[PDB]
């Protein structure tokens, strides 16, 4: 699928995801999907 559910991935929603946090997609609204490692 072109897009995936960020909720199923269990990522975090940040208002200003920084480079340190990789971006997987976007959140529900006013938030982006990123992952911390």
Q: 6 CB contacts (<8 Å, ≥6 apart)?
A: 13, 24, 25, 26, 27, 33
The first and second tokens of residue 9, run together, are 């991935």
Beta bridge partners of 13: 33
Backbone angles phi, psi at 29, to 5 degrees: -175, 140
What technique solved it?
Answer: NMR
Q: Classify the phi-psi angles of 7: left when phi > 0, otherwise alpha if psi is within -120 to 50, otherwise beta.
A: alpha
Q: Which residue has the tokens 């999907």?
A: 33
Cα separation, 25 vs 13, in Å, equals: 10
DSSP string, 1-37: --S--HHHHT-EEETT--TTSEEEEE-SSS-EEEE--
Q: Which of 5, 10, 12, 7 is nearest to 32 (CA)?
A: 12
């Amino acid at each position: 699928n072109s897009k995936r559910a960020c909720y199923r991935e269990g990522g975090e929603c940040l208002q200003r995801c920084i480079g340190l946090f990789h971006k997987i997609g976007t959140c529900n609204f006013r938030f982006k999907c990123c992952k911390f490692q």
